[PDB]
Design a protein around this ligand. Structure first.
Ligand SMILES: CCCCCCCCCCCCCCCNC(=O)[C@H](CO[C@H]1O[C@@H](CO)[C@@H](O)[C@@H](O)[C@@H]1NC(=O)CC)OP(=O)(O)OC[C@H](COC(=O)CCCCCCCCC)OC(=O)CCCCCCC
Ligand SMILES: CCCCCCCCCCCCCCCCCC(=O)N[C@@H]1[C@H](OC[C@H](OP(=O)(O)OC[C@H](COC(C)=O)OC(C)=O)C(=O)NCCCCC)O[C@@H](CO)[C@@H](O)[C@H]1O
Ligand SMILES: CC1C(O)C[C@@H](O)C(C)(C)[C@@H]1CC[C@@H](C)CCC[C@H](C)CCCC[C@H](C)CCC[C@H](C)CCC[C@H](C)CCCC(C)(C)O
Ligand SMILES: [Cu+2]
Ligand SMILES: [Cu+2]
Ligand SMILES: [Cu+2]
Ligand SMILES: [Fe+3]
Ligand SMILES: [Fe+3]
Lengths: 923, 120, 98, 48, 48, 48, 46, 27
């Protein structure tokens, strides 16, 4: 009886929040860029951060201000303190009484008055000024909330009797659901009233807190003169279950919304979203008497696209059906056939609009598996699309491939595992890939009824491969397209973007070709080779792209010597930069050959000498323009004895330098415990030659346990002026890195250092000297000295002499930070703590997140400005009551010393102060 | 072919229990600081789900209890109660034995009169 | 109809906090004076305080007018079968501020 | 304004109100209510 | 049809009303076609 | 005490309905006039 | 167990898992989440 | 075919108790 009472009882969960807060600022800069970075790269926790960490948009705690109640993001350029503070953002008044906001330090540059608006002289001269000061008037807030949770025992459903011509028994199937429900008192700030059914908040839908006054917030509170507060009670629930399965042994029928299914690639790659609402039936004949050892299986799908959706949507009156059948006659070779169809009904043929084909009918067969020591992967498809309209003129498009290679479990092809193995280690000829491709030009995700895909995933990386992990397009080979200059509006000149990149028009050409990658394992020797030619579907050599190559390695004792030859002959246009540095579209010929020798004495040390020679379009081509990466079979070898693996990808980042110019911390990464500067490569294949010693601390029997350094020298070829055939190895790069953690006593030291003396502009790094050093100390609590002190520390210096074609400017930075925590302070359970941080910078800047996956970074700019961010943060604690105080100042002067901080132009820095009293309480 | 077998079941004879064995045992950590006392009585092998009021009984065994020391808590599903309490030292002066009892209600009450006791 | 609570939620225990350090937690027990329950209908003097002053300004909301069917005779949320529906509110009063 | 005539011949619409005149907006002022009903296929989950 | 407790119901019906001549007035858009109705349902009763 | 707890306790009753439906017609006639009539005069149950 | 001791147990299990089972033991429970209170109130072979 | 439904109907048991029943192997 007690269990029955508990099953359907409410758990009452009240919550109380108590806290005092005051904050005064004049510019709202950011202070999270001063705090130490943890070994996982996260910044140390403080009581002043505004938050804002978003992985989707790349936002971090360092992209927003931390004072007042405002989280104003930092603004790049001069409007912000070069990414250090908030923008100036004048306000512009209009004649009709409307207003706009101008984001700049000079309103005169407001070159965007709308068509009919005229600046009315209402403010200073029609331009106002948005106040840069934010205030949080000191107050103590008590927040009270209450929720009612359920026992969570309603996770099952049992079927009931049904039927009209008959009556089912009932209680035959038990389904596990994922319903999470309870009672809430108040609505979240992000709730809304969805009046359209799209499931998303359209333009100002309802603001559910505004629909139910008194639900939450401060705008409305349903009160009582006696002091009572009333809040509406809502029933909140999530239903994560949309599929219901019936039947156990041979036959299982699943009914639900947005059914996800997969016949094969090129036909019903309809998982990762699903296609619509309906049912799927799966029949497994693995226990049949006569034929059950072949594991016969049948799948059948019926559904309506997107369920019910309004007209003008692609899935209105459109229904899909399909059936697949497969077996495994041999060890693992599964062979299957499948029929798929999608079409409009009489209500979709009329009043649907869009462009969905009147009918698509695809047939196919596939032969994936591993049977007799070899792995086969084949696929055939036929489309027969009915292109709506009136005449239609049904169009057919096939897609066939046959590959002898190893597919992973995620259906991506692993080209590093042979799958042939025609011998042992002494004589070990290994076939890695042997494939043919006949994808037609008109075969897209509509031809074979899928969600996405069947197009080059990169067009710059391996562009014959359609495999797209983002959209779940599991398909080995892609529908290639031909690229050409656009010339949309202007005539005579090709259209370009603002950055100068070309604008291309892509026409699908399909794909047809073959490719073999193999390697023969000798004894102390090993050899490998690859060949690959792909044309358009029609076979015209105007779209051919052939890559051939081969490598040979000899490794013995502690010496290894490799030699690689790579070619790329692309009559296919290809987009790339020329010698001058302007993007172009046109055929390419790349010839590379690299001989690199390595010696490993075994004491953790290593030495490496290399000579790599690129040759683009017949000229020596100081740097290849990424063309060699257009093929998916690169297959270089690796140094070391007994390492005869022919792994795909030309390891161009081997024994060469790094060209990074961005960093999370103020100093050039030498103060970031999540960045190993000695393992930073450029990943660009150069026409150069050089040597590089080093030392690894993770390798056992090393001189120093945790020590890594990467001293190295190199010389890079550069043409005579810009495009001359003649040239010389005049460029010179001398680089060095070091990293040493150690733990002397109770403290935990960490040293990092980097150097560079480049002579030319390699990828984006200018030509000049570049050095950096950083030290991090973190003492554990001392149990001998009174107060149990626990110290910290941080120092970082960065220097760079950027010799760019527009200046010879020096960009240096200096970051420091110290702090001591007293874990035993007078009264019991009393703690005190103080941390002082500082960051000075010459011509450097911060670039905030771009709103995409890219994050913000500190870089060098020629802005003649010196930033002087400083702050002190004192955190004391009684038993569990935390007093946090913080005072920070940001001043950005110029060479003269004008002190542009606090940009009202009064010669005063921006200042921020905060005081908080925090107290966490639980019921 | 619905192979069906119908079997009458026998009423058994061995019905020994299966769960927490009521075997009271534990320790106490009375810690004085600056005029306040923090007492932590971690017990194991107790009743699986029961309120366990514990206070300081003075000398006199019977004796009164300084009820300004009542530590209340309930047990888990194995029988683990963790009593915790803050009492001025001047109050607990002249106390003799920390007596743990059973709680009729979360408001306190002495269902049992000493299931376990430690000399202080 | 009203729904009262057991009244056993009269205590709070502090939790660990701090950024430069971390307090032990469960160190102080505070007695609060929160009286809460569930009501079905609103009183006559209830109002929607849209300014924060805590007092009824000139015709603020007349909370019975905001939630029709809460109380009174002006509005009654009914059903042809004879059922009467009244919104459920979580009423609470906090007398503790220190 | 619009009205609905329930008959197989709109010419027999002997009930134009006092001041209303048939505007030649449809075929000749008379439309035609579609007789086709559609329930687009969907799977519905209702929770209470 | 019905599997364990999942019921598949399908129905196709036709209504044609001709005159003596054979004008086939059904589906009264006057195109000589009968009225037609088709339905497909999948029903599943579940209990907590 | 258990009876006192049960006297003023809520019984939580959740309901879930799952079902797929599609229907296409051009005139919307009636089909219940085709089904057999039961001995009590009611028409046989159907899913349409 | 209803209100007069009318407990009606039901359940589906693939025969493959069942193999080597010798007796269906009925126990008491501590909650609807499985658990074991009594170790064999009623039982039968097969 | 390959699944086993088992209906143990018990009577004269304890008024409102839980009765977890399963299959104990030979041991
Ligand atoms: C146990 C249940 C027994 C069966 C119950 C009675 C049903 C059979 C009687 C004939 C009834 C089915 C006859 C086939 C109609 N045709 C369909 O498939 C249409 C497809 O829509 C549209 O597609 C376009 C391109 O795709 C075009 O063709 C359009 O023109 C078409 N729309 C239109 O204009 C409407 C004709 O679906 P629908 O909207 O009519 O949906 C319902 C259908 C039919 O229902 C079933 O019978 C399925 C039962 C499967 C249970 C499988 C589970 C087994 C469990 C052990 O369901 C399908 O999807 C299947 C497709 C037909 C194959 C049938 C053989 C298993
Ligand atoms: C385990 C079992 C799982 C069950 C679930 C899976 C169900 C599988 C169903 C398989 C049925 C056989 C398929 C035959 C394929 C013929 C190959 C094929 O699809 N033909 C293509 C297409 O066809 C049109 C289609 O033909 P269709 O015969 O498919 O439909 C008839 C009937 C549907 O009935 C209803 C409800 O009205 O469905 C059946 C078979 O019952 C049709 O007439 N619809 C009129 C409307 C035209 C637009 C779709 O016309 C051209 C393009 O307009 C061209 O592109 C052709 O290549
Ligand atoms: C009958 C019955 C009953 O009544 C009582 C009692 O016995 C039961 C209840 C069990 C019962 C039900 C039995 C029930 C379970 C049904 C049986 C199960 C099987 C599974 C059904 C499907 C069998 C068909 C099979 C799967 C098709 C095989 C063909 C291959 C797919 C061909 C592939 C070839 C490809 C194209 C080559 C590659 C070519 C390219 C170019 C692509 O490289
Ligand atoms: Cu911040
Ligand atoms: Cu749809
Ligand atoms: Cu996919
Ligand atoms: Fe919406
Ligand atoms: Fe007010």
């Amino acid at each position: 009886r007690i269990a029955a009472l508990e099953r359907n009882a409410f758990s009452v969960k009240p919550s109380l929040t108590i806290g005092y807060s005051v904050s005064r600022t004049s510019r709202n800069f950011d202070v999270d860029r001063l705090f130490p970075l943890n070994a996982d790269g996260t910044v140390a926790n403080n009581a002043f951060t505004s938050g804002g960490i978003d992985t989707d948009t790349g936002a971090q705690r360092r992209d927003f201000g931390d004072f007042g109640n405002a989280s104003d993001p930092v603004v790049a350029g001069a409007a912000g303190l070069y990414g250090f503070a908030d923008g100036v953002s004048y306000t512009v008044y209009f004649t009709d009484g409307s207003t706009a906001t101008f984001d700049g330090l000079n309103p005169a540059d407001y070159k965007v008055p709308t068509g009919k608006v005229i600046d009315t002289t209402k403010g200073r001269n029609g331009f106002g000024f948005n106040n840069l000061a934010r205030y949080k008037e000191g107050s103590t807030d008590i927040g009270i909330s209450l929720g009612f949770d359920t026992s969570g025992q309603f996770s099952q459903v049992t079927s009931g009797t049904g039927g009209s011509l008959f009556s089912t028994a009932g209680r035959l199937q038990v389904n596990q659901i994922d319903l999470n429900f309870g009672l809430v008192t108040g609505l979240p700030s992000d709730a809304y009233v969805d009046t359209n059914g799209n499931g998303k908040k359209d333009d100002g839908e309802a603001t559910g807190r505004g629909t139910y006054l008194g639900s939450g917030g401060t705008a409305a509170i349903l009160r009582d003169p006696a002091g009572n507060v009333y809040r509406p009670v809502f029933f909140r629930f999530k239903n994560a279950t949309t599929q219901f399965s019936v039947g156990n042994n041979p036959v299982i029928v699943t009914l639900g919304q947005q059914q996800k299914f997969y016949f094969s690639d090129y036909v019903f790659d309809n998982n990762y979203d699903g296609r619509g609402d309906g049912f799927t039936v799966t029949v497994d004949g693995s226990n049949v008497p006569v034929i059950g050892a072949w594991k016969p299986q049948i799948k059948g799908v019926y559904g309506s696209r997107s369920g019910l959706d309004g007209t003008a949507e692609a899935g209105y009156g459109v229904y899909y059906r399909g059936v697949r059948a497969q077996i495994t006659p041999v060890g693992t070779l599964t062979a299957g056939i499948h029929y798929a169809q999608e079409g409009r009904d009489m209500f979709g043929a009329a009043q649907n609009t869009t462009s969905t084909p009147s009918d698509v009918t695809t047939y196919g067969a596939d032969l994936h598996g591993k049977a007799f020591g070899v792995e086969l992967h084949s696929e055939y498809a036929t489309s027969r699309v009915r292109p709506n309209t009136a005449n239609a003129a049904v169009q057919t498009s096939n897609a066939f491939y046959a590959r002898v290679a190893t597919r992973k479990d995620n259906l991506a092809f692993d080209l590093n595992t042979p799958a042939a193995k025609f011998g042992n280690d002494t004589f070990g000829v290994s076939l890695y890939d042997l494939n043919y491709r006949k994808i037609d030009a008109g075969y897209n995700n509509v031809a074979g009824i899928s969600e996405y895909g069947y197009g080059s995933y990169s067009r710059t990386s391996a562009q014959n491969i359609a495999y797209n992990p983002d959209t779940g397009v599991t398909a080995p080979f892609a529908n290639l397209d031909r690229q050409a200059y656009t010339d949309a509006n202007n005539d005579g000149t090709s259209d370009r973007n603002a950055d100068g990149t070309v604008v291309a028009t892509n026409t699908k050409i399909g794909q047809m070709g073959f490719g073999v990658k193999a390697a023969a394992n000798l004894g102390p020797v090993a050899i490998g080779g690859y060949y690959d030619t792909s044309t358009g579907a029609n076979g015209d050599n105007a779209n051919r792209m052939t890559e051939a190559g081969g490598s040979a390695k000899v490794a013995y004792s502690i010496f290894s010597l490799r030699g690689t030859y790579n070619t790329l002959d692309s009559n296919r246009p290809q987009i790339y930069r020329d010698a001058a540095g302007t993007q172009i579209i046109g055929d390419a010929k790349v010839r590379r050959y690299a001989v690199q020798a390595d010696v490993t004495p075994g004491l953790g040390l290593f030495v490496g000498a290399y000579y790599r020679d690129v040759n683009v379009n017949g000229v020596r081509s100081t740097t290849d323009r990424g063309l060699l990466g257009r093929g998916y079979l690169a297959s270089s070898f690796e140094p070391g004895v007994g390492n005869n693996a022919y792994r795909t990808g030309l390891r161009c980042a081997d024994n060469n330098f790094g060209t990074g110019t961005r960093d999370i911390d103020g100093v050039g990464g030498v103060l970031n415990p999540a960045v190993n500067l000695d393992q930073s490569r450029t990943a660009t294949c150069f026409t150069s030659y050089g040597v590089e010693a080093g030392h690894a601390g993770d390798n056992a029997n090393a001189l120093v346990k945790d020590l890594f350094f990467r001293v190295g020298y190199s010389r890079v070829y550069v043409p005579t002026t810009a495009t001359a055939t003649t040239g010389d190895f005049s460029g010179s790069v001398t680089y060095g890195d070091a990293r040493y953690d150690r733990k002397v006593g109770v403290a935990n030291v960490r040293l990092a250092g980097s150097f560079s003396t480049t002579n030319t502009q390699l990828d984006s790094r200018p030509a000049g000297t570049r050095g950096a050093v950083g030290l991090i100390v973190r003492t554990d609590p001392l149990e001998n000295v009174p107060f149990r002190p626990q110290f910290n520390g941080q120092v970082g210096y960065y220097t760079a002499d950027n010799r760019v074609a527009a200046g010879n400017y020096n960009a240096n930075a200096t970051k420091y930070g110290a702090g001591v925590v007293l874990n035993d302070f007078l009264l019991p359970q009393t703690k005190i703590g103080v941390r002082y941080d500082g960051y000075m910078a010459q011509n450097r800047q911060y670039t905030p997140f771009d709103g995409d996956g890219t994050q913000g970074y500190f870089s060098d700019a020629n802005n003649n400005r010196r930033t002087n961010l400083n702050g002190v943060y004192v955190e004391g604690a009684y038993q569990d009551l935390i007093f946090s105080y913080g005072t920070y100042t940001l001043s950005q002067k110029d060479l003269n010393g004008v002190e542009y901080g606090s940009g009202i132009n009064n010669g005063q820095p921006a200042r921020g102060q905060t005081f908080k009293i925090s107290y966490k309480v639980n019921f | 072919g619905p192979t069906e077998g119908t079997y009458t079941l026998a009423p058994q004879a061995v019905v020994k229990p299966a769960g927490p064995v009521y075997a009271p045992a534990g320790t106490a950590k009375i810690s004085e600081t600056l005029g306040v006392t923090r007492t932590t009585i971690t017990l194991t092998g107790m009743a699986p789900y029961a309120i366990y009021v514990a206070h300081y009984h003075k000398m006199g065994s019977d004796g009164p209890a300084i009820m300004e020391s009542r530590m209340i808590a309930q047990a888990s599903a194995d029988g683990k109660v963790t009593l915790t309490g803050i009492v001025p030292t001047a109050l607990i002066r002249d106390a003799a034995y920390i007596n743990v009892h059973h709680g009729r209600d979360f408001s306190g009450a002495l269902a049992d009169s000493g299931v376990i006791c430690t000399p202080i």
